[PDB]
Design a protein around this ligand. Structure first.
Ligand code: M7Y
Ligand code: K
Ligand code: K
Ligand code: ZN
Length: 367
Protein backbone atom coordinates (compact mmCIF):
# COMPACT_ATOMS: atom_id res chain seq x y z
CA UNK A 1 0.00 0.00 0.00
CA UNK A 2 2.66 2.55 1.13
CA UNK A 3 5.76 3.14 -1.04
CA UNK A 4 9.27 2.29 0.20
CA UNK A 5 11.82 5.15 0.23
CA UNK A 6 15.40 3.82 0.26
CA UNK A 7 17.43 6.08 2.59
CA UNK A 8 20.10 6.34 5.26
CA UNK A 9 22.18 9.43 6.18
CA UNK A 10 25.37 7.43 5.46
CA UNK A 11 24.05 6.39 2.04
CA UNK A 12 23.32 10.05 1.17
CA UNK A 13 26.73 11.31 2.40
CA UNK A 14 28.37 8.62 0.28
CA UNK A 15 26.35 9.66 -2.77
CA UNK A 16 26.98 13.37 -2.01
CA UNK A 17 30.69 12.94 -2.76
CA UNK A 18 30.12 11.97 -6.41
CA UNK A 19 31.91 14.20 -8.90
CA UNK A 20 29.76 16.39 -11.21
CA UNK A 21 26.68 16.13 -8.89
CA UNK A 22 28.13 17.30 -5.53
CA UNK A 23 25.61 17.22 -2.64
CA UNK A 24 22.77 16.33 -5.03
CA UNK A 25 21.54 13.35 -2.98
CA UNK A 26 21.38 15.62 0.08
CA UNK A 27 19.48 18.32 -1.81
CA UNK A 28 16.94 15.83 -3.11
CA UNK A 29 16.32 14.15 0.28
CA UNK A 30 16.42 17.52 2.04
CA UNK A 31 13.60 18.84 -0.20
CA UNK A 32 11.55 15.63 0.12
CA UNK A 33 11.80 15.89 3.94
CA UNK A 34 10.91 19.60 3.74
CA UNK A 35 7.65 18.77 1.96
CA UNK A 36 7.10 16.13 4.71
CA UNK A 37 6.73 13.34 2.14
CA UNK A 38 8.96 10.89 4.05
CA UNK A 39 6.20 10.86 6.72
CA UNK A 40 3.96 9.04 4.17
CA UNK A 41 6.60 6.43 3.09
CA UNK A 42 8.30 3.39 4.63
CA UNK A 43 11.94 4.45 5.06
CA UNK A 44 14.30 1.47 4.51
CA UNK A 45 18.07 1.59 5.16
CA UNK A 46 19.87 0.17 2.12
CA UNK A 47 22.18 -2.81 2.31
CA UNK A 48 25.59 -2.78 0.72
CA UNK A 49 25.93 -5.15 -2.23
CA UNK A 50 28.30 -8.05 -1.70
CA UNK A 51 30.84 -9.01 -4.36
CA UNK A 52 28.68 -12.06 -5.25
CA UNK A 53 25.64 -9.81 -5.80
CA UNK A 54 27.56 -7.39 -8.05
CA UNK A 55 29.13 -10.34 -9.87
CA UNK A 56 25.61 -11.41 -11.02
CA UNK A 57 26.20 -8.95 -13.91
CA UNK A 58 29.73 -7.60 -13.70
CA UNK A 59 32.82 -9.70 -14.42
CA UNK A 60 35.11 -10.58 -11.52
CA UNK A 61 38.00 -8.92 -13.40
CA UNK A 62 36.17 -5.59 -13.55
CA UNK A 63 34.98 -5.52 -9.92
CA UNK A 64 38.46 -6.45 -8.68
CA UNK A 65 40.06 -3.61 -10.70
CA UNK A 66 37.43 -1.12 -9.54
CA UNK A 67 38.29 -2.16 -5.97
CA UNK A 68 42.05 -1.69 -6.42
CA UNK A 69 41.68 1.71 -8.03
CA UNK A 70 39.35 2.84 -5.19
CA UNK A 71 41.93 2.30 -2.38
CA UNK A 72 44.99 3.78 -4.07
CA UNK A 73 44.61 6.09 -7.12
CA UNK A 74 44.94 6.10 -10.90
CA UNK A 75 48.71 6.78 -11.18
CA UNK A 76 50.07 3.15 -10.80
CA UNK A 77 47.22 1.60 -12.88
CA UNK A 78 47.37 2.33 -16.62
CA UNK A 79 45.22 -0.85 -16.80
CA UNK A 80 42.29 1.60 -16.08
CA UNK A 81 41.51 2.60 -19.72
CA UNK A 82 40.64 -1.05 -20.46
CA UNK A 83 37.87 -0.94 -17.80
CA UNK A 84 36.40 2.39 -18.90
CA UNK A 85 38.01 4.69 -16.32
CA UNK A 86 39.10 7.83 -18.30
CA UNK A 87 37.97 11.49 -18.17
CA UNK A 88 34.31 10.34 -18.61
CA UNK A 89 34.71 8.15 -15.47
CA UNK A 90 37.41 9.37 -13.03
CA UNK A 91 39.40 6.69 -11.22
CA UNK A 92 38.92 8.55 -7.91
CA UNK A 93 39.33 7.17 -4.38
CA UNK A 94 36.31 5.58 -2.65
CA UNK A 95 34.39 4.77 -5.86
CA UNK A 96 34.05 1.01 -5.21
CA UNK A 97 32.24 1.74 -1.92
CA UNK A 98 29.92 4.21 -3.72
CA UNK A 99 29.19 1.56 -6.35
CA UNK A 100 28.46 -1.18 -3.81
CA UNK A 101 26.22 1.25 -1.87
CA UNK A 102 24.23 2.35 -4.93
CA UNK A 103 23.90 -1.22 -6.24
CA UNK A 104 22.87 -2.24 -2.73
CA UNK A 105 20.11 0.38 -2.50
CA UNK A 106 18.65 -0.73 -5.82
CA UNK A 107 18.94 -4.42 -4.79
CA UNK A 108 17.25 -3.64 -1.46
CA UNK A 109 14.44 -1.84 -3.25
CA UNK A 110 13.89 -4.84 -5.54
CA UNK A 111 13.91 -7.11 -2.47
CA UNK A 112 11.19 -5.01 -0.82
CA UNK A 113 9.12 -5.50 -4.00
CA UNK A 114 9.62 -9.32 -4.11
CA UNK A 115 8.62 -9.67 -0.44
CA UNK A 116 5.29 -7.83 -1.03
CA UNK A 117 6.37 -5.02 1.38
CA UNK A 118 5.13 -2.44 -1.25
CA UNK A 119 4.01 -1.89 -4.89
CA UNK A 120 6.52 0.98 -5.37
CA UNK A 121 10.13 1.31 -4.17
CA UNK A 122 12.31 4.38 -4.65
CA UNK A 123 16.09 4.93 -4.91
CA UNK A 124 16.70 8.39 -6.44
CA UNK A 125 20.50 8.04 -6.10
CA UNK A 126 20.38 5.05 -8.51
CA UNK A 127 19.80 4.92 -12.30
CA UNK A 128 23.41 4.36 -13.51
CA UNK A 129 22.18 3.07 -16.86
CA UNK A 130 25.40 3.19 -18.97
CA UNK A 131 27.68 0.75 -17.09
CA UNK A 132 28.66 -2.45 -18.91
CA UNK A 133 29.56 -5.85 -17.51
CA UNK A 134 33.31 -5.08 -17.66
CA UNK A 135 33.48 -1.37 -18.39
CA UNK A 136 32.41 1.85 -16.71
CA UNK A 137 30.79 4.40 -19.02
CA UNK A 138 29.27 7.90 -18.83
CA UNK A 139 29.98 8.33 -15.12
CA UNK A 140 28.28 4.96 -14.35
CA UNK A 141 30.67 2.61 -12.51
CA UNK A 142 28.12 -0.14 -11.85
CA UNK A 143 24.74 -0.83 -13.45
CA UNK A 144 22.46 -0.80 -10.43
CA UNK A 145 19.39 -0.89 -12.69
CA UNK A 146 20.53 -4.24 -14.16
CA UNK A 147 21.17 -5.69 -10.66
CA UNK A 148 17.68 -4.74 -9.54
CA UNK A 149 16.18 -6.28 -12.68
CA UNK A 150 18.06 -9.54 -12.01
CA UNK A 151 16.81 -9.54 -8.39
CA UNK A 152 13.18 -8.93 -9.48
CA UNK A 153 13.52 -11.85 -11.92
CA UNK A 154 13.39 -14.29 -8.96
CA UNK A 155 9.66 -13.54 -8.52
CA UNK A 156 8.56 -11.84 -11.76
CA UNK A 157 8.78 -13.71 -15.10
CA UNK A 158 8.73 -10.72 -17.49
CA UNK A 159 10.17 -7.28 -16.51
CA UNK A 160 9.85 -3.90 -18.26
CA UNK A 161 12.64 -1.32 -18.09
CA UNK A 162 11.61 2.23 -19.03
CA UNK A 163 14.30 4.87 -19.36
CA UNK A 164 13.20 8.53 -19.52
CA UNK A 165 16.68 9.98 -19.02
CA UNK A 166 17.85 12.23 -21.82
CA UNK A 167 20.49 9.64 -22.66
CA UNK A 168 20.00 6.24 -24.25
CA UNK A 169 19.89 3.53 -21.56
CA UNK A 170 22.53 1.53 -23.40
CA UNK A 171 24.13 -0.44 -20.56
CA UNK A 172 20.79 -1.87 -19.48
CA UNK A 173 19.68 -2.56 -23.06
CA UNK A 174 22.99 -4.31 -23.85
CA UNK A 175 22.67 -6.53 -20.78
CA UNK A 176 19.32 -7.89 -21.95
CA UNK A 177 19.60 -7.52 -25.77
CA UNK A 178 19.58 -11.31 -26.27
CA UNK A 179 16.56 -12.06 -24.05
CA UNK A 180 12.79 -11.68 -24.22
CA UNK A 181 12.38 -11.99 -20.43
CA UNK A 182 13.28 -8.29 -20.01
CA UNK A 183 12.00 -5.52 -22.33
CA UNK A 184 13.95 -2.23 -22.47
CA UNK A 185 12.25 0.99 -23.60
CA UNK A 186 14.32 4.18 -23.89
CA UNK A 187 13.26 7.69 -24.95
CA UNK A 188 16.37 9.80 -25.62
CA UNK A 189 18.13 12.40 -27.67
CA UNK A 190 19.75 10.84 -30.76
CA UNK A 191 22.06 13.16 -32.71
CA UNK A 192 25.47 13.05 -34.42
CA UNK A 193 28.11 13.10 -31.66
CA UNK A 194 25.64 13.02 -28.74
CA UNK A 195 26.42 10.42 -26.08
CA UNK A 196 26.41 7.46 -26.12
CA UNK A 197 25.79 7.42 -29.92
CA UNK A 198 23.43 4.42 -29.72
CA UNK A 199 19.68 3.85 -29.64
CA UNK A 200 18.23 4.64 -33.07
CA UNK A 201 14.69 3.29 -33.68
CA UNK A 202 16.13 0.35 -35.69
CA UNK A 203 17.82 -0.82 -32.46
CA UNK A 204 15.48 -3.72 -31.67
CA UNK A 205 17.66 -6.37 -29.96
CA UNK A 206 19.28 -9.57 -31.12
CA UNK A 207 18.64 -13.33 -31.28
CA UNK A 208 15.81 -14.31 -28.95
CA UNK A 209 15.53 -10.66 -27.79
CA UNK A 210 14.84 -9.21 -31.28
CA UNK A 211 11.89 -6.76 -30.87
CA UNK A 212 12.43 -6.81 -27.06
CA UNK A 213 14.43 -3.57 -27.18
CA UNK A 214 12.51 -0.32 -27.97
CA UNK A 215 14.21 2.98 -28.79
CA UNK A 216 12.54 6.33 -29.49
CA UNK A 217 15.02 8.88 -30.92
CA UNK A 218 13.88 12.46 -30.13
CA UNK A 219 15.43 15.80 -31.18
CA UNK A 220 16.05 18.97 -29.12
CA UNK A 221 13.38 21.18 -27.65
CA UNK A 222 10.57 18.73 -27.00
CA UNK A 223 7.99 19.81 -24.40
CA UNK A 224 5.59 18.05 -22.04
CA UNK A 225 2.57 17.68 -24.35
CA UNK A 226 4.43 16.04 -27.27
CA UNK A 227 6.70 13.82 -25.12
CA UNK A 228 3.71 12.36 -23.26
CA UNK A 229 1.87 11.68 -26.56
CA UNK A 230 4.97 9.80 -27.69
CA UNK A 231 5.45 8.08 -24.33
CA UNK A 232 1.82 7.00 -23.87
CA UNK A 233 1.54 5.83 -27.49
CA UNK A 234 4.64 3.56 -27.09
CA UNK A 235 3.81 2.31 -23.55
CA UNK A 236 0.25 1.41 -24.61
CA UNK A 237 1.64 -0.87 -27.37
CA UNK A 238 4.27 -2.35 -25.01
CA UNK A 239 1.81 -3.18 -22.21
CA UNK A 240 -0.44 -5.04 -24.67
CA UNK A 241 2.38 -6.97 -26.38
CA UNK A 242 4.78 -7.70 -23.52
CA UNK A 243 2.30 -7.98 -20.59
CA UNK A 244 4.95 -7.23 -17.92
CA UNK A 245 4.73 -8.40 -14.30
CA UNK A 246 7.13 -5.78 -12.82
CA UNK A 247 8.67 -2.43 -13.85
CA UNK A 248 12.00 -0.62 -13.38
CA UNK A 249 11.71 3.05 -14.23
CA UNK A 250 14.68 5.41 -14.68
CA UNK A 251 13.68 9.09 -14.39
CA UNK A 252 16.85 11.05 -15.03
CA UNK A 253 16.02 14.76 -14.90
CA UNK A 254 18.57 15.89 -17.51
CA UNK A 255 15.54 16.24 -19.81
CA UNK A 256 14.32 19.15 -17.72
CA UNK A 257 14.42 22.75 -18.92
CA UNK A 258 17.48 24.59 -17.63
CA UNK A 259 19.72 21.54 -17.51
CA UNK A 260 23.30 22.12 -18.69
CA UNK A 261 22.73 19.35 -21.36
CA UNK A 262 20.37 21.95 -22.77
CA UNK A 263 18.58 19.56 -25.16
CA UNK A 264 14.98 18.73 -24.21
CA UNK A 265 12.51 21.30 -22.87
CA UNK A 266 10.54 19.24 -20.37
CA UNK A 267 9.04 20.08 -17.02
CA UNK A 268 8.37 17.63 -14.17
CA UNK A 269 4.64 17.82 -14.95
CA UNK A 270 5.23 16.09 -18.29
CA UNK A 271 7.38 13.32 -16.80
CA UNK A 272 4.74 12.97 -14.06
CA UNK A 273 2.12 12.11 -16.66
CA UNK A 274 4.36 9.29 -17.95
CA UNK A 275 4.89 8.14 -14.36
CA UNK A 276 1.14 8.20 -13.61
CA UNK A 277 0.49 6.20 -16.77
CA UNK A 278 2.92 3.46 -15.54
CA UNK A 279 1.51 3.52 -11.99
CA UNK A 280 -2.13 2.93 -13.13
CA UNK A 281 -0.88 -0.55 -14.25
CA UNK A 282 -0.69 -1.42 -10.52
CA UNK A 283 2.49 -3.51 -11.04
CA UNK A 284 5.50 -3.82 -8.74
CA UNK A 285 7.56 -0.73 -9.63
CA UNK A 286 11.20 0.20 -8.85
CA UNK A 287 11.86 3.94 -9.23
CA UNK A 288 15.36 5.23 -9.99
CA UNK A 289 16.98 8.57 -10.65
CA UNK A 290 19.91 9.04 -13.01
CA UNK A 291 21.12 12.14 -14.76
CA UNK A 292 20.17 15.64 -13.73
CA UNK A 293 22.83 18.32 -13.64
CA UNK A 294 20.91 21.45 -12.70
CA UNK A 295 20.80 20.20 -9.11
CA UNK A 296 17.93 22.36 -7.80
CA UNK A 297 15.80 21.57 -10.86
CA UNK A 298 16.69 17.87 -10.38
CA UNK A 299 15.48 18.06 -6.74
CA UNK A 300 12.35 20.00 -7.76
CA UNK A 301 11.63 17.27 -10.31
CA UNK A 302 12.22 14.22 -8.18
CA UNK A 303 10.37 15.78 -5.24
CA UNK A 304 7.37 16.61 -7.45
CA UNK A 305 7.46 13.01 -8.77
CA UNK A 306 7.49 11.61 -5.22
CA UNK A 307 4.35 13.70 -4.85
CA UNK A 308 2.66 11.95 -7.77
CA UNK A 309 3.57 8.48 -6.42
CA UNK A 310 1.88 9.45 -3.14
CA UNK A 311 -0.99 11.24 -4.92
CA UNK A 312 -0.31 14.52 -3.04
CA UNK A 313 -0.35 18.05 -4.51
CA UNK A 314 2.66 19.98 -3.23
CA UNK A 315 2.64 23.73 -2.63
CA UNK A 316 4.20 26.02 -5.26
CA UNK A 317 6.28 27.93 -2.67
CA UNK A 318 9.54 26.12 -1.77
CA UNK A 319 9.72 25.39 1.99
CA UNK A 320 12.67 26.82 3.92
CA UNK A 321 15.30 24.08 4.50
CA UNK A 322 19.11 23.55 4.41
CA UNK A 323 19.51 24.43 0.67
CA UNK A 324 16.81 27.13 0.25
CA UNK A 325 19.19 29.59 -1.54
CA UNK A 326 19.77 27.18 -4.47
CA UNK A 327 16.09 27.64 -5.50
CA UNK A 328 16.72 31.29 -6.52
CA UNK A 329 15.56 33.58 -7.89
CA UNK A 330 11.86 32.55 -7.79
CA UNK A 331 11.79 29.96 -4.93
CA UNK A 332 9.01 27.83 -6.45
CA UNK A 333 8.70 24.15 -7.41
CA UNK A 334 7.47 24.69 -10.99
CA UNK A 335 9.98 24.79 -13.84
CA UNK A 336 9.44 27.02 -16.88
CA UNK A 337 10.22 25.81 -20.38
CA UNK A 338 13.02 27.71 -22.18
CA UNK A 339 12.19 29.62 -25.38
CA UNK A 340 13.96 27.29 -27.74
CA UNK A 341 12.27 25.73 -30.71
CA UNK A 342 10.93 22.17 -30.85
CA UNK A 343 13.06 20.51 -33.58
CA UNK A 344 10.79 17.40 -33.69
CA UNK A 345 8.96 17.39 -37.02
CA UNK A 346 5.52 15.71 -36.60
CA UNK A 347 5.84 13.56 -39.77
CA UNK A 348 9.15 12.05 -38.53
CA UNK A 349 7.53 11.34 -35.13
CA UNK A 350 4.57 9.58 -36.79
CA UNK A 351 6.96 7.33 -38.84
CA UNK A 352 8.75 6.48 -35.55
CA UNK A 353 5.55 5.61 -33.70
CA UNK A 354 4.32 3.37 -36.56
CA UNK A 355 7.67 1.55 -36.96
CA UNK A 356 7.51 0.72 -33.22
CA UNK A 357 3.82 -0.32 -33.48
CA UNK A 358 4.94 -2.80 -36.16
CA UNK A 359 7.95 -4.09 -34.25
CA UNK A 360 5.60 -4.76 -31.32
CA UNK A 361 3.24 -6.75 -33.61
CA UNK A 362 6.05 -9.31 -33.93
CA UNK A 363 6.01 -9.77 -30.10
CA UNK A 364 2.30 -10.81 -30.19
CA UNK A 365 2.47 -12.85 -33.46
CA UNK A 366 5.58 -14.81 -32.23
CA UNK A 367 4.21 -15.51 -28.68
C1 M7Y B 1 30.27 13.40 -16.57
C2 M7Y B 1 28.83 13.86 -16.90
C3 M7Y B 1 27.88 12.83 -16.31
C4 M7Y B 1 28.49 15.24 -16.32
N1 M7Y B 1 28.17 16.08 -17.49
C5 M7Y B 1 27.76 17.48 -17.29
C6 M7Y B 1 28.95 18.30 -16.72
C7 M7Y B 1 28.81 19.70 -17.35
C8 M7Y B 1 27.42 19.71 -18.05
C9 M7Y B 1 27.31 18.26 -18.55
C10 M7Y B 1 28.28 15.34 -18.60
O1 M7Y B 1 28.07 15.73 -19.74
N2 M7Y B 1 28.63 14.08 -18.35
C11 M7Y B 1 28.78 13.06 -19.26
C12 M7Y B 1 30.04 12.90 -19.78
C13 M7Y B 1 30.33 11.90 -20.67
C14 M7Y B 1 29.34 11.02 -21.04
C15 M7Y B 1 28.06 11.15 -20.53
C16 M7Y B 1 27.72 12.15 -19.60
C17 M7Y B 1 26.27 12.17 -19.16
C18 M7Y B 1 25.58 11.02 -18.83
C19 M7Y B 1 24.15 10.98 -18.48
O2 M7Y B 1 23.39 11.94 -18.46
N3 M7Y B 1 23.56 9.81 -18.19
O3 M7Y B 1 22.16 9.84 -17.91
K1 K C 1 16.43 7.32 -22.00
K1 K D 1 15.51 -7.45 -24.17
ZN1 ZN E 1 21.49 11.43 -18.94
Amino acid sequence: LVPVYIYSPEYVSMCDSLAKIPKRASMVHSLIEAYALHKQMRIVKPKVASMEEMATFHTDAYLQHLQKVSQEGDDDHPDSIEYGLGYDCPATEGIFDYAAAIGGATITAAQCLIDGMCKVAINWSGGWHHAKKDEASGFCYLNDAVLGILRLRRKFERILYVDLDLHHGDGVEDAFSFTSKVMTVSLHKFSPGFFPGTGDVSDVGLGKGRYYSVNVPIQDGIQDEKYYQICESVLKEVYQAFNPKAVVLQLGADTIAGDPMCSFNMTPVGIGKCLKYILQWQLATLILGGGGYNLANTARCWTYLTGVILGKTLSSEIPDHEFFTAYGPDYVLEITPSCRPDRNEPHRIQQILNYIKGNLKHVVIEG
